[PDB]
Amino acid sequence: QGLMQFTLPVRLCKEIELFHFDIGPFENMWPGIFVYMVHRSCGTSCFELEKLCRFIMSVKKNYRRVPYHNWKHAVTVAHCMYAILQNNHTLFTDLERKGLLIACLCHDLDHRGFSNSYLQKFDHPLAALYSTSTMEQHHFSQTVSILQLEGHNIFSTLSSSEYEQVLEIIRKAIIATDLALYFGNRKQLEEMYQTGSLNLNNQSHRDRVIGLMMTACDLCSVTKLWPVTKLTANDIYAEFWAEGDEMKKLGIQPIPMMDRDKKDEVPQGQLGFYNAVAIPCYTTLTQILPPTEPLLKACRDNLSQWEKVIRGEETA
Numbered sequence: 001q002g003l004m005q006f007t008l009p010v011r012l013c014k015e016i017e018l019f020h021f022d023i024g025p026f027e028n029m030w031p032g033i034f035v036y037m038v039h040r041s042c043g044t045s046c047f048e049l050e051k052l053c054r055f056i057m058s059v060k061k062n063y064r065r066v067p068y069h070n071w072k073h074a075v076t077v078a079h080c081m082y083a084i085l086q087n088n089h090t091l092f093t094d095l096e097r098k099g100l101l102i103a104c105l106c107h108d109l110d111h112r113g114f115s116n117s118y119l120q121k122f123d124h125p126l127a128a129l130y131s132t133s134t135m136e137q138h139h140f141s142q143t144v145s146i147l148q149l150e151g152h153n154i155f156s157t158l159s160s161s162e163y164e165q166v167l168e169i170i171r172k173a174i175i176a177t178d179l180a181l182y183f184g185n186r187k188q189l190e191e192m193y194q195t196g197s198l199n200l201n202n203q204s205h206r207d208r209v210i211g212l213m214m215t216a217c218d219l220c221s222v223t224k225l226w227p228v229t230k231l232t233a234n235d236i237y238a239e240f241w242a243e244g245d246e247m248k249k250l251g252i253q254p255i256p257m258m259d260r261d262k263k264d265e266v267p268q269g270q271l272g273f274y275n276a277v278a279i280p281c282y283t284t285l286t287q288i289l290p291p292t293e294p295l296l297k298a299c300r301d302n303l304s305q306w307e308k309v310i311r312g313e314e315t316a
């Protein structure tokens with residue numbers, strides 16, 4: 001009952017509070033870690049533990065054995081959201097605490113390792129069904145499916161209209177992880193913040209901020225200790241290159257990040273990605289949520305590490 005608290009070994013208990021925490025190589029431990037994060041950020045009364053565990057294991061089952069967009073990534077993204085929530089606890093509603101961890105867990109459901117562009121060029125049926133944010137609408141669709149399985153409705157105690165709000169929080173959160181949308185969203189939040197217009201009681205403003213939190217959480221692999229960030233970059237390029245292979249099989253030249261014949265220009269590509277995407281992302285998020293500072297700091301640190309790789313002072 002509410003007398004049963006989830007607990008972590010001492011190192012995990014302490015370090016899970018750090019933005020740069022790595023959830024480790026033991027898959028069996030990740031459901032325990034997520035439940036722990038839900039109990040401490042939401043509460044032990046937020047979800048029926050039996051439903052949550054059933055919902056978690058179905059979500060895990062619907063993640064694929066791909067190098068990067070996998071179950072480890074879902075929990076990692078949830079953990080980053082947990083860290084943002086714990087250090088900005090005053091700024092979020094009950095529905096947002098409930099819904100955002102779950103959105104992070106579900107945000108890449110049934111990812112096969114291929115971008116929205118590959119599905120468009122392949123003419124995947126999902127591209128007829130969802131003309132933009134294709135994968136992201138599929139991720140949400142899969143979330144809803146899993147909620148509608150017997151014994152899986154973790155939101156069963158909520159009123160009809162709360163359930164609808166929480167699903168709309170989840171839907172918009174998952175859609176926000178379409179990076180094609182992030183550039184617009186970050187520009188808008190940037191202008192809004194500088195002008196002083198930004199207003200966390202304005203729902204459409206809340207939506208934008210949660211969307212940037214999701215971008216930041218989604219990319220949070222660039223905010224880990226260097227060994228984690230460097231090893232995780234191998235996994236994403238494994239997917240990028242498999243997709244470039246598939247682009248080439250369609251007789252289409254892939255963009256450079258997905259061409260494995262450009263493996264030697266990964267440090268250059270990363271430098272490009274941090275300056276254009278990551279740094280601006282965590283910068284804007286740090287302005288809006290000052291206590292998310294360590295994400296930006298660890299991002300600048302890993303940039304300086306890539307610079308070191310370029311100049312031959314570091315290996316990868």
Ligand SMILES: CNC(=O)c1c(NC(=O)c2nc(C3CC3)ccc2Nc2cncnc2)cnn1CCOC
Pocket residue numbers: 179218219221222229230232233236257269270272273276277
């Ligand atoms: C839009 N750009 C690019 O998506 C892009 C790159 N994307 C990533 O590296 C990357 N993308 C995602 C999301 C977009 C798919 C997440 C993590 C990434 N990296 C990473 C590094 N370390 C550890 N885990 C992950 C690389 N080159 N470009 C082109 C150059 O862009 C400026």
Ligand SMILES: [Mg+2]
Pocket residue numbers: 107108111135177178
């Ligand atoms: Mg995704």
Ligand SMILES: [Zn+2]
Pocket residue numbers: 069073077107108177218
């Ligand atoms: Zn993701």
